[PDB]
Design a protein around this ligand. Sequence first.
Ligand SMILES: NCc1ccccc1-n1nc(C(F)(F)F)cc1C(=O)Nc1ccc(-c2ccccc2S(N)(=O)=O)cc1F
Ligand SMILES: [Ca+2]
Lengths: 234, 52
Amino acid sequence: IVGGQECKDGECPWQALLINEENEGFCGGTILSEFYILTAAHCLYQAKRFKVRVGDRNTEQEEGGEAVHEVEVVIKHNRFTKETYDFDIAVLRLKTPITFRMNVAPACLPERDWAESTLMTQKTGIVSGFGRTHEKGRQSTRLKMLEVPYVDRNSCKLSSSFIITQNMFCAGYDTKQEDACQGDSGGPHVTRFKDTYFVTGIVSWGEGCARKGKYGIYTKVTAFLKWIDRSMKT
Amino acid sequence: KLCSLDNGDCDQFCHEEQNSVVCSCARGYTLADNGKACIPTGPYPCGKQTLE
Ligand SMILES: NCc1ccccc1-n1nc(C(F)(F)F)cc1C(=O)Nc1ccc(-c2ccccc2S(N)(=O)=O)cc1F
Ligand SMILES: [Ca+2]
């Protein structure tokens, strides 16, 4: 996350971190329930075998509230391709159930029509992750969050050198130096409504980070609610 | 405006049935007696920051 602020105690409980064999986070995720994590399909290439850590806010040491969960089943959308980055979504079923506590809680999945009419029409959303804090740099050891304005669909299509499909939406700033960055992929994009946070997107991609005239691209969760539901069953 | 007028006074989901507002909640929540508020069923309902 470029810019933004540190996620303070209990502010981003639905954040999940995918860790490789070296116990280093390479992508984020969103806790949906005790057994399921939502993330980006393109992350399932960043590492072969991986696990999921929840309740972490500081990568340096171990507070005692963190918990590691092995993945039982990986469900990646069969239509994802690096050529288009379309259908950038995946669901993970964990071997053991997550125990909710301070800094560990699921984000709500909204209904399609309501989310589109009421959530995605709000002024802003929140993105978070342990990603880079500058285009060139190491991953952040601290979990960060950033309020990102929803961006007009026509405006973002124009500003993009890549096709923005109906499974994607844009959020961020035109010139203000704040945006998601490498490593934040798969992380949550949530929208607050009456103090309740609903997952509305998955950190997907962007042409550079916080680049002037460029916005952040996110997978539109509302376009895959039925796909997600089917995944949390099989 | 029904659902378009302040989300029909619903805490969460708002639908229009028979040209009337009908509120509903995410899993883990129960619709309150007033048919508008959503009451959590456990200590860690979805979408709530853990600030306590
Ligand atoms: N705001 C950025 C961001 C947010 C979230 C996660 C990662 C990034 N970064 N971070 C970096 C940096 F740091 F600069 F190296 C680079 C990226 C990034 O997404 N590049 C990228 C840029 C474009 C595409 C893309 C889209 C559609 C079709 C094909 C492609 S394609 N693949 O070109 O054929 C995919 C990417 F992956
Ligand atoms: Ca820690």
